[PDB]
Design a binder for this molecule. Structure first.
Ligand code: GDP
Ligand code: MG
Length: 169
């Protein structure tokens, strides 16, 4: 009598959706992964004594113009929205995505969190921790920063989204 969460991973293009997800499930940082591929990864994690069966949707990517059709919500238990702290564009884009996603959802409390990835690039960082935090807060969302190089930060991210579901249960 375990539970089952299905998580949508959303974000611009080359912000590390795949790399972050793969890191969590394989224990491995990959060099490249094909950015056409939508793939569902699976994983066990135990959270507050409850064994969870995760399905992780590594979406191909979105942008400003992308379209969230009415059906997308259907069987989605949670949404993780990812930008890169090195691409202002990806931060621009994630605000837009959030807007369209919040419209496609309507009223429901199905949790949404926000992640600043690529934190390991001290020299390439353009977005501050504060900047993304303010966004999350503005949405009443969770906010973590991450690195697909670092396993433990990835674990925090997919663990946190489950937590955020549990809050509302
Ligand atoms: N240094 C660093 N590179 C990353 C990180 N996350 C992703 N990358 C790299 O950025 C590119 C995009 O990764 P990917 O997961 O394919 O992004 P996606 O297109 O959103 O799935 C790849 O070249 C990765 O090797 C990170 O946290 N740190
Ligand atoms: Mg990808």
């Amino acid at each position: 009598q375990s539970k089952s969460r299905k998580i949508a991973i959303l974000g611009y293009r080359s912000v590390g959706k795949s790399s972050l997800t793969i890191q969590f499930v394989e224990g491995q940082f990959v060099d490249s992964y094909d950015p056409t591929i939508e793939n569902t990864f699976t994983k066990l994690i135990t959270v507050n004594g409850q064994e969870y069966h995760l399905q992780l949707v590594d979406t191909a990517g979105q942008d400003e113009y992308s379209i969230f059709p009415q059906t997308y919500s259907i069987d989605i238990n949670g949404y993780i929205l990812v930008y890169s702290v090195t691409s202002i564009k990806s931060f621009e884009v994630i605000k837009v995505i959030h807007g369209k996603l919040l419209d496609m959802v309507g009223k429901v409390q199905i949790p949404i969190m926000l992640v600043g990835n690529k934190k390991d690039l001290h020299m390439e960082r353009v977005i501050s921790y504060e900047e993304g935090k303010a966004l999350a807060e503005s949405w009443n969302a969770a906010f973590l920063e991450s690195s697909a190089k670092e396993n433990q930060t990835a674990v925090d991210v997919f663990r946190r989204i489950i937590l955020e579901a549990e809050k509302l249960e």
